[PDB]
Design a protein around this ligand. Sequence first.
Ligand SMILES: NCCc1c[nH]c2ccccc12
Length: 195
Amino acid sequence: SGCSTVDTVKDFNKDNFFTGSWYITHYKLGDSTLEVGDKNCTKFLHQKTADGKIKEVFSNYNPNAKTYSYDISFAKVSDFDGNNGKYTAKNVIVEKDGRKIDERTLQVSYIDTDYSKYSVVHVCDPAAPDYYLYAVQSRTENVKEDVKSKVEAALGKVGLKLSGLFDATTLGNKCQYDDETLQKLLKQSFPNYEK
Ligand SMILES: NCCc1c[nH]c2ccccc12
């Protein structure tokens, strides 16, 4: 039952983490074998402002269907678990123009990160525990060769191996990212969630 609890990064430096963008390079979604509809290229853009708001905008592109989906996580600094890389966010699935399609609560747990290259995350919805995500994330489109070992270890903690995830860098050539929508939605106002 429920979302798994996983150990997370101690002394999480929010300032150094929530800036710039991330590419999702590898991931396991749920228990069943992955269908092509859930094989995507995801890039996200995020920020922490002085008011203490954290905002994270995702572009998810499915090469098989050649379609995009977008979602946004909203959180506040006081939603974090002390000094650890663990927090709850309201995540809103939205149209390109920001119109709300659906919303959910996501418990986020950062297993590890070096801030400037890679992070390893577990994301889960308490209302839909069957939807859980283990993700490898990079500051570049591919994982830097010199941190592969660090990523492998992090996945070790949670009973996983890289070759055990879907490698999104296999989509590779067909991958694309809606950078302009990312930038636009990040700056756009959402008074219903930014409160
Ligand atoms: N965009 C919804 C799932 C997701 C992927 N990576 C994340 C990092 C933090 C929060 C959610 C996520």
